[PDB]
Amino acid sequence: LALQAKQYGDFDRYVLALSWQTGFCQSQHDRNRNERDECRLQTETTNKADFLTVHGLWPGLPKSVAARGVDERRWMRFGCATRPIPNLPEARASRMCSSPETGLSLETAAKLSEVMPGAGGRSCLERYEYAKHGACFGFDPDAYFGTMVRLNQEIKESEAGKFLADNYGKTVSRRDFDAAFAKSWGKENVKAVKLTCQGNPAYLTEIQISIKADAINAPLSANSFLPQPHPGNCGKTFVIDKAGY
Numbered sequence: 001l002a003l004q005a006k007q008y009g010d011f012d013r014y015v016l017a018l019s020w021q022t023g024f025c026q027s028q029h030d031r032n033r034n035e036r037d038e039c040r041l042q043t044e045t046t047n048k049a050d051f052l053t054v055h056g057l058w059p060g061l062p063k064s065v066a067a068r069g070v071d072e073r074r075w076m077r078f079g080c081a082t083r084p085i086p087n088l089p090e091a092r093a094s095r096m097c098s099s100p101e102t103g104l105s106l107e108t109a110a111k112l113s114e115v116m117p118g119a120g121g122r123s124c125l126e127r128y129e130y131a132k133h134g135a136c137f138g139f140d141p142d143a144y145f146g147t148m149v150r151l152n153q154e155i156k157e158s159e160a161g162k163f164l165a166d167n168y169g170k171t172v173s174r175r176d177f178d179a180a181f182a183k184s185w186g187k188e189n190v191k192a193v194k195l196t197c198q199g200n201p202a203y204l205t206e207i208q209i210s211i212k213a214d215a216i217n218a219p220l221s222a223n224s225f226l227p228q229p230h231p232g233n234c235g236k237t238f239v240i241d242k243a244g245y
């Protein structure tokens with residue numbers, strides 16, 4: 001079913017946040033902080049594109065929220081928990097399992113956990129994500145998580161996804177990554193993407209893509225994206241990190 005905000009629907013974009021998950025378990029081997037009952041699978045799949053996983057679908061700052069003195073920084077920091085509104089309880093990145101159960105269908109939770117290692121179990125990434133980015137909007141949990149799953153699959157299947165798979169383990173240029181993205185969605189949309197990296201040399205850890213809120217329920221196309229001002233912190237060339245940290 002279609003994703004629709006029941007309140008605070010007055011925002012212009014969603015940010016699709018994808019993890020290059022190979023650096024979602026290598027990152028906590030670089031800084032060394034915590035490991036989770038997820039990267040333990042170590043399942044060398046077949047399609048290298050599948051190391052691109054769903055992190056989140058983050059609505060931008062609603063106009064009715066901004067009107068009450070909330071800025072981008074605050075919205076980014078707290079989402080649904082921003083003050084004075086929407087002022088829902090702050091979700092805790094530590095104990096994601098203490099956020100409300102999202103009430104998603106068993107079909108949805110299955111499809112979700114295949115592309116979101118941190119979903120369910122003793123991790124509950126999806127509870128945290130829904131609490132910070134979805135509950136205040138009243139999004140149907142099944143449409144919300146089904147939508148991010150679909151979008152991730154569209155990215156993985158695009159020339160950007162193929163690019164990641166073909167260059168698995170390799171050092172690529174931002175120029176060539178951009179050209180792959182452009183092959184599917186056009187050069188005018190290359191700026192909808194922010195890449196995050198860690199390390200020096202830089203290795204890819206996250207891909208965030210800004211999507212027009214009114215295009216969220218359609219397959220991605222030339223008209224789906226919103227260019228944004230941050231290319232990210234990867235620099236000119238970076239590594240498409242392999243698994244085996």
Ligand SMILES: Nc1nc2c(ncn2[C@@H]2O[C@H](COP(=O)(O)O[C@@H]3[C@H](O)[C@@H](CO)O[C@H]3n3cnc4c(=O)[nH]c(N)nc43)[C@@H](O)[C@H]2O)c(=O)[nH]1
Nearest residue numbers: 015056058075076077079093129132194196208230232233
């Ligand atoms: N789900 C989730 N979203 C977050 C979190 N922290 C920030 N965000 C979000 O990320 C979005 C945009 O992505 P970013 O550009 O902020 O990713 C960051 C960017 O790479 C760089 C800024 O140029 O630092 C990063 N960055 C990532 N996490 C953090 C953080 O906890 N604090 C700060 N100060 N910065 C953070 C926002 O819409 C916002 O909701 C979080 O803990 N969980």
